[PDB]
Amino acid sequence: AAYFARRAAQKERVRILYRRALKDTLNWAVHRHIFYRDASDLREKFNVNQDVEDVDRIDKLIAHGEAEYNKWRHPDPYIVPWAPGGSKFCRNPTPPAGIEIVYNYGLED
Amino acid sequence: YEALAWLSGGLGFFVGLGLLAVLNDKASKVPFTPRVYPYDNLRVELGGEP
Amino acid sequence: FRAKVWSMTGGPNCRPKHWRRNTAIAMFGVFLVCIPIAKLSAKLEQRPHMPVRPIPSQIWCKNFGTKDDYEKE
Amino acid sequence: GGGMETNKNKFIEDWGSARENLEHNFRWTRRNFALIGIFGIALPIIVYKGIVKDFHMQDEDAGRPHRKF
Amino acid sequence: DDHLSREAVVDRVLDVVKSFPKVDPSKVTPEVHFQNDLGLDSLDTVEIVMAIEEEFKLEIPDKEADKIDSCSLAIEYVYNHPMS
Amino acid sequence: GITYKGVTVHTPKTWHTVTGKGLCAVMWFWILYRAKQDGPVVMGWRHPWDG
Amino acid sequence: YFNLSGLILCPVLGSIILLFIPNSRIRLIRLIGLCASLITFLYSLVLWIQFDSSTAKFQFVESLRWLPYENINFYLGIDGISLFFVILTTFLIPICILVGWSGMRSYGKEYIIAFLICEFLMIAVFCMLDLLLFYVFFESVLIPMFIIIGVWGSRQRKIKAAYQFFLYTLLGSLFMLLAILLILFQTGTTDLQILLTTEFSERRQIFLWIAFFASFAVKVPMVPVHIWLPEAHVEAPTAGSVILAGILLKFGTYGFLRFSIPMFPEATLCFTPFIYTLSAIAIIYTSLTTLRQIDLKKIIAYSSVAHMNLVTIGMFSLNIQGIGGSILLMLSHGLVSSALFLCVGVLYDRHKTRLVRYYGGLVSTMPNFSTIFFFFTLANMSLPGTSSFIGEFLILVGAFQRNSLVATLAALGMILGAAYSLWLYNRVVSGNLKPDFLHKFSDLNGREVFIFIPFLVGLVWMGVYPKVFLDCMHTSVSNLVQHGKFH
Amino acid sequence: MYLLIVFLPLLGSSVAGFFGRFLGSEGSAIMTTTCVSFSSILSLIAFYEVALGASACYLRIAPWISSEMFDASWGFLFDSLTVVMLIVVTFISSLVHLYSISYMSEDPHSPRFMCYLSIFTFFMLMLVTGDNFLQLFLGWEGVGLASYLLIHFWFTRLQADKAAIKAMLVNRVGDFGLALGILGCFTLFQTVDFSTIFACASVPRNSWIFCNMRLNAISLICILLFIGAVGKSAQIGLHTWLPDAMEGPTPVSALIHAATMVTAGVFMIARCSPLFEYSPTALIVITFAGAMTSFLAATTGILQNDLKRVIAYSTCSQLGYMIFACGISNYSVSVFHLMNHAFFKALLFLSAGSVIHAMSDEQDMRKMGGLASSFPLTYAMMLIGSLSLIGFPFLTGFYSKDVILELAYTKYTISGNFAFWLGSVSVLFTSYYSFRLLFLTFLVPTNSFGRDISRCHDAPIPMAIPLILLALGSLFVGYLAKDMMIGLGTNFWANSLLVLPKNEILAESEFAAPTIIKLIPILFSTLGAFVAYNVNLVADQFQRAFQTSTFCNRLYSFFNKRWFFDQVLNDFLVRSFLRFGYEVSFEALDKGAIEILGPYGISYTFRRLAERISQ
Numbered sequence A: 001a002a003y004f005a006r007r008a009a010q011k012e013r014v015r016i017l018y019r020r021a022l023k024d025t026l027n028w029a030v031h032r033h034i035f036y037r038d039a040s041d042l043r044e045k046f047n048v049n050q051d052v053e054d055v056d057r058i059d060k061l062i063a064h065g066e067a068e069y070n071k072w073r074h075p076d077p078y079i080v081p082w083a084p085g086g087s088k089f090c091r092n093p094t095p096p097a098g099i100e101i102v103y104n105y106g107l108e109d
Numbered sequence B: 001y002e003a004l005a006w007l008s009g010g011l012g013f014f015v016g017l018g019l020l021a022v023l024n025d026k027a028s029k030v031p032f033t034p035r036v037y038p039y040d041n042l043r044v045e046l047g048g049e050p
Numbered sequence C: 001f002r003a004k005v006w007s008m009t010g011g012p013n014c015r016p017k018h019w020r021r022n023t024a025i026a027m028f029g030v031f032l033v034c035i036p037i038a039k040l041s042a043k044l045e046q047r048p049h050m051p052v053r054p055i056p057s058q059i060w061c062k063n064f065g066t067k068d069d070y071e072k073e
Numbered sequence D: 001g002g003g004m005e006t007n008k009n010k011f012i013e014d015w016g017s018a019r020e021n022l023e024h025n026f027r028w029t030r031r032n033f034a035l036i037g038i039f040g041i042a043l044p045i046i047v048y049k050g051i052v053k054d055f056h057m058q059d060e061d062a063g064r065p066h067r068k069f
Numbered sequence E: 001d002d003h004l005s006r007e008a009v010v011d012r013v014l015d016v017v018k019s020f021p022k023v024d025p026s027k028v029t030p031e032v033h034f035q036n037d038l039g040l041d042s043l044d045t046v047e048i049v050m051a052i053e054e055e056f057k058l059e060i061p062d063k064e065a066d067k068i069d070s071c072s073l074a075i076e077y078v079y080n081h082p083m084s
Numbered sequence F: 001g002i003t004y005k006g007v008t009v010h011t012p013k014t015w016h017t018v019t020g021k022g023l024c025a026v027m028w029f030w031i032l033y034r035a036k037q038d039g040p041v042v043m044g045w046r047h048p049w050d051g
Numbered sequence G: 001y002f003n004l005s006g007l008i009l010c011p012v013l014g015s016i017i018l019l020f021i022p023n024s025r026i027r028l029i030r031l032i033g034l035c036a037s038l039i040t041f042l043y044s045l046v047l048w049i050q051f052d053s054s055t056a057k058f059q060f061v062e063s064l065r066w067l068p069y070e071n072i073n074f075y076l077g078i079d080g081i082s083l084f085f086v087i088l089t090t091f092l093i094p095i096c097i098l099v100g101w102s103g104m105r106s107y108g109k110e111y112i113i114a115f116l117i118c119e120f121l122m123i124a125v126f127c128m129l130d131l132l133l134f135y136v137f138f139e140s141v142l143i144p145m146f147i148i149i150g151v152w153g154s155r156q157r158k159i160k161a162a163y164q165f166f167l168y169t170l171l172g173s174l175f176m177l178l179a180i181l182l183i184l185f186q187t188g189t190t191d192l193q194i195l196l197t198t199e200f201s202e203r204r205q206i207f208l209w210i211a212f213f214a215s216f217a218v219k220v221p222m223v224p225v226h227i228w229l230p231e232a233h234v235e236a237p238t239a240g241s242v243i244l245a246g247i248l249l250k251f252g253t254y255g256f257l258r259f260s261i262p263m264f265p266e267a268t269l270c271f272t273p274f275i276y277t278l279s280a281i282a283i284i285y286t287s288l289t290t291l292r293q294i295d296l297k298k299i300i301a302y303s304s305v306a307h308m309n310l311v312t313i314g315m316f317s318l319n320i321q322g323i324g325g326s327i328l329l330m331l332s333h334g335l336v337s338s339a340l341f342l343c344v345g346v347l348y349d350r351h352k353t354r355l356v357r358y359y360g361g362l363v364s365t366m367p368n369f370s371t372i373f374f375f376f377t378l379a380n381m382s383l384p385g386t387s388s389f390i391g392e393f394l395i396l397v398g399a400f401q402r403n404s405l406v407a408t409l410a411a412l413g414m415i416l417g418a419a420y421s422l423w424l425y426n427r428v429v430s431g432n433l434k435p436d437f438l439h440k441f442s443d444l445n446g447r448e449v450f451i452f453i454p455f456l457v458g459l460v461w462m463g464v465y466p467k468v469f470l471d472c473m474h475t476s477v478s479n480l481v482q483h484g485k486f487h
Numbered sequence H: 001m002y003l004l005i006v007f008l009p010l011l012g013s014s015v016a017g018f019f020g021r022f023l024g025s026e027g028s029a030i031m032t033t034t035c036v037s038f039s040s041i042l043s044l045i046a047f048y049e050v051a052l053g054a055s056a057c058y059l060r061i062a063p064w065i066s067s068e069m070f071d072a073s074w075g076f077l078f079d080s081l082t083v084v085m086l087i088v089v090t091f092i093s094s095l096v097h098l099y100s101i102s103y104m105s106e107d108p109h110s111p112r113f114m115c116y117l118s119i120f121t122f123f124m125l126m127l128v129t130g131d132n133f134l135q136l137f138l139g140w141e142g143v144g145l146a147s148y149l150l151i152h153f154w155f156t157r158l159q160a161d162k163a164a165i166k167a168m169l170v171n172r173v174g175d176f177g178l179a180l181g182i183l184g185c186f187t188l189f190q191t192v193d194f195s196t197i198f199a200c201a202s203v204p205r206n207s208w209i210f211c212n213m214r215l216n217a218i219s220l221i222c223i224l225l226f227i228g229a230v231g232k233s234a235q236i237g238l239h240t241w242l243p244d245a246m247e248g249p250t251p252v253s254a255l256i257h258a259a260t261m262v263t264a265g266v267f268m269i270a271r272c273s274p275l276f277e278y279s280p281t282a283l284i285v286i287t288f289a290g291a292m293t294s295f296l297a298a299t300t301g302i303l304q305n306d307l308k309r310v311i312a313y314s315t316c317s318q319l320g321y322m323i324f325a326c327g328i329s330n331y332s333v334s335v336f337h338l339m340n341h342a343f344f345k346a347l348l349f350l351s352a353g354s355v356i357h358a359m360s361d362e363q364d365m366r367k368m369g370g371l372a373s374s375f376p377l378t379y380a381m382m383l384i385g386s387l388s389l390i391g392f393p394f395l396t397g398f399y400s401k402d403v404i405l406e407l408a409y410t411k412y413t414i415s416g417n418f419a420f421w422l423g424s425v426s427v428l429f430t431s432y433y434s435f436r437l438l439f440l441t442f443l444v445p446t447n448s449f450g451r452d453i454s455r456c457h458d459a460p461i462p463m464a465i466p467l468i469l470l471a472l473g474s475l476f477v478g479y480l481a482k483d484m485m486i487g488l489g490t491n492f493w494a495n496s497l498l499v500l501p502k503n504e505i506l507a508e509s510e511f512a513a514p515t516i517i518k519l520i521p522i523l524f525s526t527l528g529a530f531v532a533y534n535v536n537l538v539a540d541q542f543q544r545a546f547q548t549s550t551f552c553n554r555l556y557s558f559f560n561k562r563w564f565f566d567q568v569l570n571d572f573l574v575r576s577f578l579r580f581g582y583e584v585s586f587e588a589l590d591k592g593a594i595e596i597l598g599p600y601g602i603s604y605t606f607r608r609l610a611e612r613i614s615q
């Protein structure tokens, strides 16, 4: 094949799913002294295979990883309050850049 | 649609625990007697006729 | 563009220079129109009951202890 | 930037002046017959029967014979 | 609402990778990428992002979150973002 | 408050600590004050008001 | 001696003077038209001063012969009900002149001719005791509304809008005309005082009631026939569209009060469940149809349809309070719907979109319009303290006292009224501001600010103290409810 | 003088709103709050001259609806029951007004906020002082209107808009029952006033003809009134709004979510006391609904990880407790718990807002850790408030929860025992999540960010005086009011609250206590303390995160999504309504079906018939 487009997708999904797993680990681990061990467990789990070369042995792995990850979601994940979904999104947004208001409208002659 | 299945159980616990309060019959387990007032259970001051 | 719109209830950060002067007028305005509400109510507030102890509302009121009977309403 | 009127986007104009005229779509189809026969002839009849039944039960409590209506 | 300039950000951003034990804190650079020059594993790429997120309150959208493969991209980004 | 490597905490004002302490001590004393005078009311022993 | 003749003559003089005024003198045309309208309004108001709300018989009457044997003739007069409608008709028209004041140069003098013609036309409808001529002026309003919708319509699709509004009206009009002919041939005259004192046949009662219901169910939007109002009402000029829901919508509903209820005492009782089963499902179906709507004009028209279907329930529920509440609700609706269409038309006269998708975030600008719109939405939201709530509470009271089932369905209407009107308010003037479409826009100037002042003051006045309105017509409602029966 | 109690907040609101440009962001703040404080002083004077000097005050301004024998008037009923709630509303409203000026100093649209607050104060004063159902109905609708306006304080905020709209619809569907109730009670008495139906409210004993079948008359009226109170008390029927209502500003939430509009639904029952006691059927269903709502909220609040969200469920649990108190003819504990609640939950709301806006506007449990030693004042305040909330022995909250649970135990009816069981098992839940709140914040290692801790600023002085006043209150008011108003026949209520001879179980709720049940809720409280401390401080290695296979993640989702009510109710009622309002009414009724008579229905019919007639 010699096409890195497929593997670049793999190197993209692995980082995306690792970031999402770390976020969810932070959410589940309300206290952090357990979050260290849990994060270590997640990082070690991602290094279990760490050697995939065949294209036939990645699609099943990514499907299994996605299915297992989606099984626990922490229905209330962390969103920054000003983030798109937070507790103060569009709190007092900056006014639109260009808008003008005419004064004398409805006059005659 | 799976939520409705959990909905039936959630309210089922309430009504199920409500029926259990019928299976013990605490009404007959009163340690005292019904309250009684003078003058035909205060008939004059609760209506009726003077 | 906020200065263009009137914002009758005041702008976002509307801070007039003489806001203390206006507030003094506004507070005085409430008091002067509050008196007719108090004065017109003196012909009202019918309470036939007589309190066990004297209250301080006997000076401006007389509608207490008078409406005893209910056969001539 | 001196136009007080709206820009009148093309994709919104069709959405606007398409629902205004739905006679062509709603002429003859299977679901239309069920919907009309269940919500224009069924429900009015049921509520009318309920109202006349309520009037009859009100009459019976007072004792007066029910009017034919 | 101080909106700290580049002077106070060049240190805080670089401290995140300075505290990383896999990379030796002897040749850490403001302009460097961990893929080749610093020699970091391809899995810990987003871990630095989480660590810097724990310092500055801002979460880059995930579409270009991992697009930052260099230390320069992160610091110019966190300066570009106003609420950081 | 003294500054550290990220936590440059500001010490609470003078009236935001002593007032809290001297108001909470009132409640702490009041718990026992009501547990001594009206305490014997609800314990099952020594019912007060002519008992 | 401020009799009813002058109240009708004054708009005629206003129209006649305007006919022979050159088009160039645009300064004089608007001034004299507005002056004539305001003189008519004051002449209507002074009638309320000398109303004498004591007698069961009719007030000032004018009799003008119409047939060689005085068989039927122009017989004017008000009793207790058409007085308020006359006042509100005389009050709405100057608002119509004022709203279409800035753009009068394009409209010309023909704009005021139609409005003043319709003005004295609707004046002559409410105070018309003779039954047949009530139909002559009842359908005379076809031409002015036809012209207003067609000549000065907003968009080009106005051609099809006017045809429905015309033909739907003509069908019921002639169906009523047949009943009028049957009544005249049977009785002999059409004078109201006599014709109310004629023993009818029960079999004849049902047919004539149906014949009247043929048209009176078109003026008030009923379930079978309500398509004309939205299509022929979104496509009319704001000054003209504000009286299709203002006075042109109160003919049939008020026509029930004067020519159906006391006319056919034994038929309304036999047809009471049919009106209930029509209106109760109307208030539900139309309200649900309102939710999935995008045009700004159509939603207000649908809310008006729901309000009329609600008032129809309280009108046919014969109660001393049901009919009074019906009249209060009709007056309040005439105020609030008129105000709402002016509020949604001032937006159109600046941007010309009539789409809620474009509108959004209009609280960050033009806040005065936002406050006025919120107040009138609350009035349409059916809150106590406004004149509407006084309107439908009596409707609910009258319906529940007779039938328990109909009251619940009617109150479902005021429950569902919070689903579309509040959604429109939050989706038009309280959303996120978008500069892509509404690049620039102004606020209300001194004209539309003063236009809403009489509306606001009348709304609050009839909401917090509706005593005078009820005081002036308790005798007439009592006489109307007690008719035919003697117990 | 009595008119000044009600009209001054309205006058202040009107002048502030009309002239919010003449007065700065501080002129309105110092003017409307001053007017509300004057009204509070007037309310205190009225309380001194009425509650202690027992002589109720009556008046009538003008006839509102002067129709035939339907006399509606602007009169008010300054009664002994009413003046207690006058105190409750005025004191808390003035304290909230003082609270907001510090919070709103940064929020731009300041004067509009105090305008809305004064509108709410005027509306609820009109409600509580009212004496006619319809004239009380204007206050009932105005409370909802002000709630919508205040939650809609952020027009840009999309979530606030949807929350406000949904709150208005659910509140309308709720008070639908009460609205039906006004004219339901009118068709039997031909009147709407209170003094003319409480005089003779037991005489009617007939039936009616409802939509389906004939049922009782008084019982149906009371059922409708309770359904109306459901909408304004977040009962089992419609409580979709309150959990999502904290999308607006904080100082109002201390007044609308946990202090006063809380009291509307319970005060509905409390005012019309000699109407529900003659409808025993309605009392039983009221008790069921109250207990069910209380338990549901108590078990709801535990999973949520937000400051305002969890305490809203605590407020709903107190709503359920108070509804049960009003359901067993024991309205005394109902109003006593109302007065306590308006103190010890308003205080907690102010404390939560103080710790939220002083920590870069963050309200979370998962992210924010511990900063108790950074500032002891408002934490001491909130600790006192929580101790009242659990009802630690010999505190303000104990004197209400203990007596209400004892009253629940005493009544042997089929609803008394069930609801007592539910309250006893809900005490454990409430003492669990209250201490969970006390522990996940201020008692854990700080899990927040390093920038927010540096930008730390304690509670300003003007916003701390209301907290001081509320702390002074909800430590002595319970002891002061235990004897004087629940004291086995206290003579100050007079006709305000009437209890029937038959269902009067108070003396044997204290002299027949087994002493093994009276002091048991303290036992559940300490057990909840132990389990919460163990789980959230030490034993959290497995007791916190449960990464099992199945039935445990779904258990997490079931209570996080609050029994999927927002899912099942939405999809099965409002989604269906919106679908069938476009695909039924607009398809097979008017547009498309009968439109075969308008355009393209008959127009083309005459393009063939008329064509083949010239030839």
Ligand SMILES: CCCCCCCCCCCCCCCCCC(=O)O[C@@H](COC(=O)CCCCCCCCCCCCCCC)COP(=O)(O)OCC[N+](C)(C)C
Binding pocket: C002, C005, C007, C008, C009, C010, C011, C012, G363, G364, G365, G366, G367, G368, G370, G371, G374, G375, G378, G383, G384, G385, G386, G460, G464, H010, H013, H014, H017, H018, H109, H112, H115, H119, H142, H145
């Ligand atoms: C149940 C009905 C009772 C009667 C109805 C009146 C009750 C009050 C209803 C109105 C309340 C205020 C709602 C106004 C609209 C809110 C949104 C809005 O448009 O705000 C406007 C209007 O602001 C107002 O709220 C004005 C309030 C005026 C209402 C005051 C009267 C209320 C008391 C009257 C009640 C009747 C008394 C009894 C009469 C016998 C401007 O606000 P800004 O702070 O300037 O923000 C806009 C952003 N920008 C600055 C960039 C433009």
Ligand SMILES: CCCCCCCCCCCC(=O)SCCNC(=O)CCNC(=O)[C@H](O)C(C)(C)COP(=O)(O)O
Binding pocket: A010, A011, A012, A014, A015, A021, A024, A025, A042, A045, A046, A047, A048, A049, A050, A051, A052, A061, A064, A065, A066, A068, A069, A072, E041, E042, E043, E044
């Ligand atoms: C509570 C939610 C937690 C979720 C837990 C469940 C998550 C799924 C667990 C089950 C599936 C897994 O193990 S997920 C493990 C997925 N791991 C991989 O796919 C290895 C890919 N390796 C490569 O591409 C190359 O060797 C190389 C570029 C050198 C490596 O660099 P990167 O790999 O960096 O790109």
